[PDB]
Amino acid sequence: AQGHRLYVKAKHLSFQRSKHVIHPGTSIVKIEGCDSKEEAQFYLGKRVCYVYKSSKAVRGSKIRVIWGTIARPHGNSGAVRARFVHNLPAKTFGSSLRVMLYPSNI
Amino acid sequence: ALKEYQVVGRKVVPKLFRMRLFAPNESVAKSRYWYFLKMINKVKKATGEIVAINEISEPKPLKAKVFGIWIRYDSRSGTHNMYKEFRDTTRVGAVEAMYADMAARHRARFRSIRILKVVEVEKKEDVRRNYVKQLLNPHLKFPLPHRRTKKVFAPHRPSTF
Amino acid sequence: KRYVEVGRVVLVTKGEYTGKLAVIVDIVDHKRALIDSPCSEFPRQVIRYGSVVLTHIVMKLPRGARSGIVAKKWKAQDVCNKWASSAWAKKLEAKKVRSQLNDFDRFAVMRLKKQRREQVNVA
Amino acid sequence: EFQKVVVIDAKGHLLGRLASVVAKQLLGGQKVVVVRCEELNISGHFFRNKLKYLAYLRAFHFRAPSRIFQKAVRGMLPHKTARGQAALEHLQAVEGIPPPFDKQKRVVVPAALRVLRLKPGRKYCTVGRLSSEVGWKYNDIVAKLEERRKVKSAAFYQAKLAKQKKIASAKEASPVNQKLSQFGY
Amino acid sequence: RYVIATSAPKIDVSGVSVEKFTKAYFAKQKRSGPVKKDEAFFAENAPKNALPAERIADQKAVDAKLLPAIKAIPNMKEYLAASFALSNGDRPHLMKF
Amino acid sequence: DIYKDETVTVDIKARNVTVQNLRHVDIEMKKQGNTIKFIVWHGSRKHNACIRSVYSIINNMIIGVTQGFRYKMSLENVSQSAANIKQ
RNA sequence: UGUUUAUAGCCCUUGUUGUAAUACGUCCACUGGGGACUGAGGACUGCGGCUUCGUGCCAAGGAUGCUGACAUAAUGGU
RNA sequence: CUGCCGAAGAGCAGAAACUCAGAUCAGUUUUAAAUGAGAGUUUCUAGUGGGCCAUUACUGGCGAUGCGGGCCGAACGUGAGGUUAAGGUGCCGGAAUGUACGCUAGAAAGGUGUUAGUUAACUAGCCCUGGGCGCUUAAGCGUACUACCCAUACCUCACCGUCUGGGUUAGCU
RNA sequence: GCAGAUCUUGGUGGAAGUAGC
RNA sequence: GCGAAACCACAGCCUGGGGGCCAGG
């Protein structure tokens, strides 16, 4: 209704990992409405970001953003692999990410 | 997927032996033929050679037929003979059902099963299976069972009717 | 009211023929059935019931009919525009059309539904 | 599509399937509320789950159906970790339907429904009746409260439908709905 | 890479000269600001970068050459005055622009 | 079985065959005319065992409803009550 | 109940529309896109390709070009 | 401190000296040549001559050996990316609550329990008797076809090191 | 060129304000 | 009021499987 939103909601699922070894350098991101690796091909290369609060007024704001990028699909059920400029904290599992629509090709 | 293959071979004017067997690809067919020939006329694999390996399609793939299949089982005792009938539209289609059925009921493997003969029974009287006869009734009409049908957490309960 | 039988017309929901309309010609077994359609792009094939929904419409058809005669039977009994008569097809075609609008057409619908809501006249 | 709070009607759902669906949602940061937990269904005859529970009775032994489901989710979560304990606090499993939740939409999980997962004729147990036999003694009042809520909700639906009749009639009354109906709406 | 190309009907733009819009036209003012070492301290000399008149004139000229094209075809004026924004249930991987 | 169908009103709403109930066993009723075509579409031998009982139970209830007599020396209910009375 | 296309049609053989079609297998020194990682080397030497010859040009013996943001900061560490 | 070589469990490991594709070899195979590798020698001079496991005294494996799975897989410089083995994809847990075909606790003989067959009797399978949560047209069991997950393994590139081979002086602006 | 030799020497702990007078 | 000493890798919830390991309570 209000609008002014140009992003697709996403969740930080977990890191890339085997059963016992984890890799914080790549993260697993589930995007809203993307349920297959065929649809996940659309969101590759898009810019995904994590936005959170703080306490210090960095340039007069309490907001902080960690940018990223979608790299490849993961699995069959629409999960994707996202690389972030700084590896996301482990405390942000299940948090809400923002998948912008740029760079765009459609 | 399984495929019908006609294998003809003979030892290096020796008699030519041709037979129809079902294999996933040609290489399995030729080895299977040699194993079958080894236990029939005692011809060595190394001595013999294959003269023709051809793939066979279904002449009438869109017509429902009944196939009677005679096979040899290997069990705990390793000696058994059965005959089963399947209704489908392809000779290879019934064979997959035959292999799936026996691996299900009798816990079989592809190696322990050898096809003795497969025939197409076109006479309804010749059918010896009650299920086959029932499926061939002129008034065959039954509701579809076992239907049951991401988007988890659907909004309304399924109709399922 | 939906009995899998010879002559019943079914709608394919899986594979590359989703949304195509076909009619059972023969019952292969308890897991498969042979279907056909007057439409040329629909070939004669044997498929399982897990890919179809049983349409309540029933057409009279001899068992094992060829593809060409099936089209004549379909034309004779006018199955076309009879399937579309039911609200089922109308919703499906409306959804199919609603999957094609670009941003402009969606913005036109924005205005249209705005021209329709403003009344809300009640007694 | 995911949002922050969901209410799930547990009637006609299998215990394991629904709990596994719920557990995966909780670890994803989604707050989940399950209502009517005493209408949950379990595959197998009544005695089978009955001997399972009495074996468990032979650790705190809890009889309520809502806490039977809560234990099922708990085993499916990393409860020994701070992450798992955080997820568990996001789950509110209740019996019946509390008044704060009866005025909100309730979704169901097709992957967990008993009708879509159990062969017809298969015997199945109900958690509510199983709990009522192992020590739970509140199913009389819960059932009675269910009838009152169902009656009140039924009246609301009739009022909603009656109001819906006016707008539905006025829909085709306006020629705009048919002027550009080609858009599919 | 930062624009969504829609299938909306194209606007007649052949009637406006565009060859004047080059790399130099859009470039930014090269760093300069000729200053002396008494006003840089007590920094009150900074002018403003208000867009000059000819930029306004070019914008008005473009508007004159574009408005009839968008007025003739319906809904263009309201479409362009609008903004694009997503809502619940909108899936960009399936919406056809 | 593939089709083990058998035979006031016969209304079969919600598997209740109110003329009575048939919810206990999945067998169809279909209320075919005066009869109730109690169909079985590829079910299980338990369904075949139930239909033979259900057919007699429905017939006994129908016979009892039309004329239950006394049979001193509700069909199953009367017989169980008589056995309970005897005990 | 019994019959042989009629007021349904079905199965088998041949001819024909036949240089059918499609599926499958395989190949193209055919071709159109999307995404990610990397940029080692440091004048020219070479192998090639276009171009009339050209200090000619080139995707050819390893990345360049065009921009933007910051010094009260951006960035990176403890 | 780092690097390199490296056992044993007379032989096995190096160093000098020589003689060398125009030379002989081989934990190999065919026949009664194929293929891989440059082959050797005299001399000395350290270390050890335990045992255990498994298949058939032999053979390996353990031992001086970490890594993935839970014996199977895999021989390890520092990393980026890709792809896999074994094992897996309901949740814990990365990955299909995949598709298709089937049977019904599960991962000597008895049974009026069941399903397919042979000639009332037998054959075959499941049930009773003699990691967690949970699961039931499965998330159990068997077969088949796809997709997916990730090892210190494989491939590509960067970098460190070692080894082997080559270049480099009228020291050319 | 030290982490250890119930290492040597010195210093300081918990026991503990305990046992105890 | 006075006031030790021996001793001390580290510490202290159970069950099962291989006093901290694995899975649960």
Add this chain to the structure above:
RNA sequence: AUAUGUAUAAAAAUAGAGGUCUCUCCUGUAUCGUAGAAGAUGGGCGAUGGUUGAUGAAACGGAAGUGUUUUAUUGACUUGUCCAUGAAAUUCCAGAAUCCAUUGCAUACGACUUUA
């Protein structure tokens, strides 16, 4: 005593329900809201609309009712429709209790019962 529109409420069955002998289901890819210098400044046409903020109320909600309406005003916006001005060089993303005292229905000591 003191969080990016945070939208969507019948029951029961999958071998039947709902609504008026007839009709519908076969998921929400639906429905409500969705254009505005982050939502500016004006004019006309058509209905008594819609969205609300603040007062005044009365009816309903007890399972955890903390919410549902009906409204009587007041103050705004209104894109229902069609026109008139403004956005820019952000010149390509970032008043109690207790102690003291007291009671013995209590009591190793606390605690309890009392008063006090």
